[PDB]
Amino acid sequence: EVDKAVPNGIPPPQLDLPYPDSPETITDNLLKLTELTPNPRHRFLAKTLITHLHDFVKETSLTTDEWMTSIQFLTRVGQICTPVRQEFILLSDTLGVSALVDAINNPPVNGATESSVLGPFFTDDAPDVANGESIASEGKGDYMYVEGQVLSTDGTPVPDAVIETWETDAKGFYDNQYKNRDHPECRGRLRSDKDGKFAYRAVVPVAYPIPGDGPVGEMLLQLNRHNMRPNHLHLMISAPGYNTLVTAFYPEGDEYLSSDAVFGVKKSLVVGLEEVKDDSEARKRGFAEGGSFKLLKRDLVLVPEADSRKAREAFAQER
Amino acid sequence: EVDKAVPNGIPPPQLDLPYPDSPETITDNLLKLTELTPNPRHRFLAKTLITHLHDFVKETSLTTDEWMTSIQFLTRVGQICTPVRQEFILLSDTLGVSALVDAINNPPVNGATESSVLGPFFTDDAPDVANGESIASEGKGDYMYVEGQVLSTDGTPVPDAVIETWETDAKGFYDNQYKNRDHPECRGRLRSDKDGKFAYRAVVPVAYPIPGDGPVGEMLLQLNRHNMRPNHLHLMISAPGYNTLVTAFYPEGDEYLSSDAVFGVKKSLVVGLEEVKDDSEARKRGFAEGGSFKLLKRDLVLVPEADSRKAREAFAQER
Ligand SMILES: CCCCCCCCCCCCCCCCCCCC(=O)O[C@H](COC(=O)CCCCCCCCCCCCCC)COP(=O)(O)OCCN
Ligand SMILES: CCCCCCCCCCCCCCCCCCCC(=O)O[C@H](COC(=O)CCCCCCCCCCCCCC)COP(=O)(O)OCCN
Ligand SMILES: [Fe+3]
Ligand SMILES: [Fe+3]
The missing domain is CATH 1.10.12 (Lyase 2-enoyl-coa Hydratase; Chain  A, domain 2)
Known part of the structure; x- marks a missing residue:
């Protein structure tokens, strides 16, 4: 049995539509x-x-066969999507569309920090982490310290901004890729202080694969492309009056930096981590075993909301 | 919980891929x-x-919102597809893609019969109907007679071709749109005779809606388009040595002819049914109530398989 369909009520158009003869x-x-x-x-x-x-x-x-293959592919992409898997986003990502749309909608005017793709590992349950505390338990990877200021494009500090941050552990897993999800790991929610400053302890993130087991994975193999992302630290910064910034910083030295499968990488977002070999300083920052840490020192420069909207509409006129 | 993904083993490409700075x-x-x-x-x-x-x-x-709406739309299209519903084909159809692909892949060489979209109502279970017999029971609508000859483009009759035909009843339903499908209705499978001739009784088909209850239906309403097809009779003709022809004839007089929601209509496939007001002739052809019938007299011209393939690849040279 198949459903009886129902007319939608739109009338036959009063337009000249000759019967196709070609x-x-x-x-x-x-x-x-x-x-x-x-x-x-x-x-x-x-x-x-x-x-x-x-x-x-x-x-x-x-061809007919190619058209039908496309149909079946797009169908399977939709059908594998669930509240925990978005294969259409992954298809948009791997075909560069996500990144292109992201750039266009968050133009980095006036020396703002550039945006980068969000990916699927954001959670709204990250614990509150005070400035100077860690988003990572001991033993989750090599020590990294992250610090800077949240600023407006004019240079004014932005106090009380919410900074969501998340990353893999040293094995390349986010915390929700483990069976035992007793507690969050390698993620946190901070607030910029009264001078717009933030700081936290973390671990050096590592390269990892995006889902290669569904239709997008099949496509990448036919294109002789990998399914890897280079190392990155995610940040999402929100503050009333400013364009929310979804971004990531990509440590130098990773062999996938030039060929991010989802085109997150941007030149301005590749960072050279500083090796700090100063055991006293390490311990004073709260690294329990001291020794040494990688330092990621970067400001987060936010665009006032009206400026972002104006830039986007002005640039859309050109195009 | 989310799956651990697995690297696909493709190496980082040795290409010059500067980190995007625009x-x-x-x-x-x-x-x-x-x-x-x-x-x-x-x-x-x-x-x-x-x-x-x-x-x-x-x-x-x-925009971001438009991109995300697209994602969600495409997702829903895939998710509503089942063995009995192909919403991606319906999307391709309503956006003219199906018909364009269909034309390109079945070029009407030497004035052969043009193809038209198959739609979803073909069944491989249609009963055998002898030439002159009916595909429609009495009481399924206004009498129609269909006759002609199956030929090659050189004019040679094609004997033993299989002619699948199907259509709505006068209420605009195909047989599998009813609860009681004890037996097929308004469909049949014929064979061209030794002179390539075929003939059968049927009913005058009527206009009907394509599914408007899913995402494609929502899209048509935003585009201020109807979801209707004009009246048509489906035919699929196969014969070893020739390109299978999937087509349909569209009776004149239907207000949706110029605006078929799936672009099936072609100039060569619009037919003017002849009103035969001859009780004697009606009875002689086997119409039980006699009276009168509409006559659809059209030959079916098939392209030799090698010619079809050659035409297609020669035309792909232009493009
Ligand atoms: C907007 C104007 C431009 C749009 C124009 C066309 C859109 C629809 C027609 C699609 C055309 C299909 C041809 C593209 C081929 C690319 C890859 C070829 C390699 C290949 O074999 O890929 C298979 C199928 O991939 C595929 O089927 C890939 C299909 C890609 C879908 C199109 C884009 C999707 C939407 C992107 C994000 C949406 C955001 C909204 C803006 C993978 O399958 P396999 O190799 O295992 O087996 C079948 C192989 N013989
Ligand atoms: C060979 C295989 C071929 C397969 C078939 C080809 C596939 C091509 C891709 C088709 C994508 C069309 C998706 C548009 C969905 C619109 C309908 C959604 C339901 C609904 O009521 O939404 C309204 C939107 O309608 C509307 O938006 C109506 C206007 C329709 C405009 C269509 C273009 C929009 C952008 C799509 C880009 C996709 C990239 C190419 C693959 C209100 O919501 P809203 O008003 O906010 O919606 C604007 C964002 N579209
Ligand atoms: Fe990530
Ligand atoms: Fe039909």
Whole structure:
């Protein structure tokens, strides 16, 4: 049995739509119809999409089998998605779309910190961590210290900003990739102080794979691409009056830096960690075993919300 | 909990991939990587796809919310697909892609019969119907007679071709849209005779809606488009040595002819049914109530398989 469908009530259009006598007329008629779309933003998106879609098909002479393979692929991508897995985001990520959209929507005007992709490992349950405390238990990897200031593009400190941070442990796992999730690990939620300063202890993150077991994984193998991300520390900074910044810093030295499978890496976000070999200083910062630590010293420069919106709308006129 | 992912074993590429310092470099790097795709057809498809995708994003300055809406839409489309519902095909259909691909892959060489979309109502269980017999029980709608000849493009009759035909009843339902499907209705499987001739009784099909209750239905309403198909009779003709023809004929007089929601209609496939007001002839053809019938007289011209393939690859030279 199959459902009886129901007419949606839209009338036959009063437009000149000649019966297609060649493949081009399909496109022409569809584009004519698209002009009936009443929201002009929707109309623009629809028109531009259709043109690209039809041009793609014409340029490639897509075959029946290739079209059907595409259909089945897109279907399987949707069907593997769950509240804990977003294969369509992963497809957007690996095809560079996520990163391109992210850039366009968060233009780094006036020397702002650049954004980078969020990925799937953010949790809204990270513990509160005071400045100087650790997001990582002892034994989760090599010591790293992170510090800087949250500032406006004009240089003014931003107090009370919320800084969410998360990363892998030394094995390349986020805390929710373990069976025993008794307590959060390698993540924290901080607040910039009254001078906009923040500091915390952490571990040196490591490279890791994105999901290669579903359709996106199959695609990467046909493209002879890897499914790896280089090491990074995630940060998300929010503060009323500013454009929320979702970003990451990528330590130098990782062989995947130039070929991030999701195009998170940006030049300004690759950081050279400083080796601090000063046992006294290490212990004073609260590293329990002292010795030495890698230092990641970086400010987080936020764009006032009105400036971000203005930049985006002004740049969208060019394009 | 989330799965540990696994590296796919592809190495970091030895390519010059500068860390993006502007959004354009995302695209440049992705296109460079794409050259590692080993199958040159895949490489071509991937490259063309990526360029269109990235151009679409740049031209529109797609917003974060629009991107996320798209993601969620595509997800829902996949998730509603089942063995009995293909919402991705419906999306391809309503955006004209299915019809465009179908045309390109079944070029009407030497004025052969043009193809048209299959839709979802084909069944491989249709009963055998002898020439002159009916695919429709009495009381399923207005009488129609269908006849013609199956031929090669050189004019040679094609004997023993298998002709699958199906259609709605006068209420606009296919047989599998009813609770009681004890037996097939308004469908049949014929064989062309030794002179390539076929003939059968049927009913005049009627306009009907495609599924409007899923994501594609929501999209059509935002585009101020209807979800209707004009009246049509489906045919699928197969014969060893020839390109299988999936087509449909669309009776004149239907207000949706110019605006088929899935772009099945083609100029050559619109047919003017002849009103035969001849009680005697109606009875002689086996119409039980006599009176009158509409006549659909159309030949089915098949392309020899080698010719179809040649035409397609020659046309792909242009593009
Ligand atoms: C907007 C204008 C531009 C759009 C125009 C076209 C969109 C629809 C048509 C898709 C065309 C398909 C051809 C692309 C091929 C690329 C990869 C080729 C290699 C390959 O074999 O990949 C298989 C299928 O991948 C695939 O099927 C990849 C499909 C990619 C889908 C298109 C983009 C998805 C959306 C991205 C994010 C959405 C954000 C919203 C803006 C993987 O399968 P396999 O190798 O295991 O087996 C089948 C192999 N013979
Ligand atoms: C070869 C295989 C082929 C497979 C088929 C091709 C696949 C191509 C991709 C199709 C994506 C279309 C998704 C649009 C969903 C819109 C409908 C959602 C439901 C709903 O009621 O949403 C409304 C949106 O309608 C609207 O937005 C109506 C306007 C429709 C515009 C369509 C273009 C939008 C951007 C899509 C980019 C995808 C990249 C290419 C793969 C309100 O929500 P809203 O108003 O906020 O929605 C704006 C963001 N779209
Ligand atoms: Fe990550
Ligand atoms: Fe139909």
